[PDB]
Design an enzyme around this catalytic site. Structure first.
Site, PDB file in Angstrom:
ATOM      1  CB  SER A 145     -14.791  20.923 -15.871  1.00  0.00           C
ATOM      2  OG  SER A 145     -13.552  21.411 -15.350  1.00  0.00           O
ATOM      3  CG  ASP A 243     -13.911  21.362  -8.052  1.00  0.00           C
ATOM      4  OD1 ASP A 243     -12.925  21.872  -8.600  1.00  0.00           O
ATOM      5  OD2 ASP A 243     -14.722  20.626  -8.630  1.00  0.00           O
ATOM      6  CG  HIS A 287     -13.130  18.444 -11.271  1.00  0.00           C
ATOM      7  ND1 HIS A 287     -13.728  19.644 -10.951  1.00  0.00           N
ATOM      8  CD2 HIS A 287     -12.693  18.575 -12.546  1.00  0.00           C
ATOM      9  CE1 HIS A 287     -13.663  20.465 -11.984  1.00  0.00           C
ATOM     10  NE2 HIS A 287     -13.030  19.843 -12.963  1.00  0.00           N
TER      11      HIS A 287
HETATM   12  C1  LIG Z   1     -11.582  24.211 -15.469  1.00  0.00           C
HETATM   13  C2  LIG Z   1     -10.717  25.416 -15.828  1.00  0.00           C
HETATM   14  C3  LIG Z   1     -11.522  26.395 -16.690  1.00  0.00           C
HETATM   15  C4  LIG Z   1     -10.244  26.045 -14.511  1.00  0.00           C
HETATM   16  O1  LIG Z   1      -9.231  27.021 -14.652  1.00  0.00           O
HETATM   17  C5  LIG Z   1      -8.667  27.389 -13.404  1.00  0.00           C
HETATM   18  C6  LIG Z   1      -7.712  28.607 -13.524  1.00  0.00           C
HETATM   19  C7  LIG Z   1      -8.470  29.762 -14.185  1.00  0.00           C
HETATM   20  N1  LIG Z   1      -9.420  30.489 -13.337  1.00  0.00           N
HETATM   21  C8  LIG Z   1      -8.896  31.438 -12.366  1.00  0.00           C
HETATM   22  C9  LIG Z   1      -9.055  31.055 -10.895  1.00  0.00           C
HETATM   23  C10 LIG Z   1      -8.487  31.881  -9.939  1.00  0.00           C
HETATM   24  C11 LIG Z   1      -8.608  31.566  -8.596  1.00  0.00           C
HETATM   25  C12 LIG Z   1      -9.282  30.410  -8.236  1.00  0.00           C
HETATM   26  C13 LIG Z   1      -9.860  29.583  -9.184  1.00  0.00           C
HETATM   27  C14 LIG Z   1      -9.742  29.902 -10.527  1.00  0.00           C
HETATM   28  C15 LIG Z   1     -10.865  30.377 -13.579  1.00  0.00           C
HETATM   29  C16 LIG Z   1     -11.777  31.136 -12.849  1.00  0.00           C
HETATM   30  C17 LIG Z   1     -13.146  31.049 -13.105  1.00  0.00           C
HETATM   31  C18 LIG Z   1     -13.606  30.206 -14.102  1.00  0.00           C
HETATM   32  C19 LIG Z   1     -12.711  29.452 -14.840  1.00  0.00           C
HETATM   33  C20 LIG Z   1     -11.343  29.541 -14.587  1.00  0.00           C
HETATM   34  N2  LIG Z   1      -6.650  28.381 -14.113  1.00  0.00           N
HETATM   35  C21 LIG Z   1      -5.482  29.197 -13.608  1.00  0.00           C
HETATM   36  C22 LIG Z   1      -4.227  28.455 -14.136  1.00  0.00           C
HETATM   37  C23 LIG Z   1      -4.573  27.247 -14.254  1.00  0.00           C
HETATM   38  C24 LIG Z   1      -6.199  27.177 -14.156  1.00  0.00           C
END
Ligand SMILES: CC(C)COC[C@H](CN(Cc1ccccc1)c1ccccc1)N1CCCC1
Ligand SMILES: *[C@@H]1O[C@H](CO)[C@@H](O)[C@H](O)[C@H]1NC(C)=O
Length: 341
Positions: A145, A243, A287
């Site tokens: 994760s 996922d 997940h």
């Molecule tokens: C397991 C966690 C690290 C995942 O976090 C998901 C995203 C952050 N993104 C951005 C994202 C944008 C579009 C689609 C997916 C994710 C993110 C992106 C890449 C790596 C980690 C987090 N957050 C946004 C608000 C709540 C969660």
């Protein structure tokens, strides 16, 4: 059991300034070392970090950590539970920095919290070198994760650290589980949270990816399909095609519009893995996988994940009957019968 060690350098801290640390079980007959990064979301401003401190405090502080933890899945020392690496030296690194393992900032008169994930990894490595890591043949940096994204952001820095310290014989590799996300269109109306976090954390990304995207655009390097081509260390990618964390960010919780959305998401994920030669991507809604006790049960095209990882090890010495690129082609969750219940 794996035993807790708090870092001897007490200036490398969790969010609240308490010392970070690692849990260790040594295997003195083995030259393999497995360093696992825990996951658990993140926080990106004062108000949401304060909330996290109230009800998710073990992810922000070492004050309440237990003396031992049991190794499970790929961290198990029993061959029946872990056919891949049961005899390895096992390390579990708790996630207490809330920064997707990217931060390099201390608590100070200007900063209520410390975000030191990238420094925590480097200090764990340095302290383990005095406990037997100096004799390793392979260091596998694994994670699930936020820890899976953490592997992508840190694996080349670990390799550079060991080279500069004078240990060029140790082969550094990565295993990124459930940290390969797509910046796609949502189903109903999130990259802003990472952009804001990077500034709040003083976050750092791998240098070649940073040079491609440049100032202000470092958030791009948090997305597996954009950072992976810049990496020099071997990386094995594990990602469910559907996922649940991806679907949550996409606001998905079935009529034609949602059916097409879900099928397009699986096709897009599959596309991003076409040129990733070590990968395991089943058509399941789920997940995380690697530290679950029943991680051995899932198969793609008849091959389990422990087998695929063993075939990866052989390839780093195509192989007959020992595949390493395993991506499902069927288009809907649970079209693979081995998906978790
Ligand atoms: C397991 C966690 C690290 C995942 O976090 C998901 C995203 C952050 N993104 C951005 C994202 C944008 C579009 C689609 C997916 C994710 C993110 C992106 C890449 C790596 C980690 C987090 N957050 C946004 C608000 C709540 C969660
Ligand atoms: C402890 O860690 C900090 C931050 O990484 C570093 O600046 C300092 O040099 C370290 N101390 C020692 C004695 O290595």
């Amino acid at each position: 059991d794996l035993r807790l060690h708090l870092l001897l350098n007490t200036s490398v801290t969790c969010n609240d300034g308490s010392p970070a640390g690692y849990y260790l079980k040594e295997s003195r007959g083995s030259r393999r070392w497995l360093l696992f990064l825990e996951g658990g979301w993140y926080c990106f401003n004062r108000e949401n970090c304060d909330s996290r401190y109230d009800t998710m405090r073990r992810l922000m502080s070492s004050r309440d950590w237990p003396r031992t933890r049991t190794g499970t899945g790929i961290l198990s020392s029993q061959p029946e539970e872990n056919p891949y690496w049961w005899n390895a030296n096992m390390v579990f690194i708790p996630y207490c920095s809330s920064d997707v393992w990217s931060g390099a900032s201390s608590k100070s008169e200007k900063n209520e919290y410390a975000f030191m994930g990238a420094l925590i990894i480097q200090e764990v490595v340095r302290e383990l070198l005095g406990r037997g890591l100096s004799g390793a043949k392979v260091l596998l940096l694994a994670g699930s994760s936020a820890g899976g994204t953490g592997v992508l952001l840190n694996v080349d820095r670990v390799a550079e650290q060991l080279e500069k310290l004078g240990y060029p014989a140790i082969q550094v590799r990565g295993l990124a589980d459930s940290g390969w996300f797509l910046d796609n269109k949502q189903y109903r109306h999130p990259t802003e949270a990472i952009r804001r976090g990077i500034r709040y954390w003083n976050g750092v990304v791998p240098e070649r990816c940073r040079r491609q995207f440049q100032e202000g655009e470092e958030w791009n390097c948090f997305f597996g399909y954009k950072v992976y081509p810049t990496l020099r260390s071997p990386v094995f990618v594990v990602q469910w095609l559907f996922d649940e964390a991806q679907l949550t960010v996409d606001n998905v919780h079935v009529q034609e519009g949602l059916r097409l959305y879900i099928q397009n998401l699986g096709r897009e994920l599959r596309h991003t893995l076409k040129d990733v030669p070590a990968s395991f991507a089943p058509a399941c809604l789920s997940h995380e996988i690697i530290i679950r006790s029943h991680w051995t049960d899932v198969q793609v095209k008849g091959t389990s994940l422990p087998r695929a990882l063993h075939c990866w090890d052989r390839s780093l010495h195509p192989l007959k009957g020992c595949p390493v690129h395993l991506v499902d082609s069927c288009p809907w969750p649970h079209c693979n019968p081995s998906c978790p219940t």
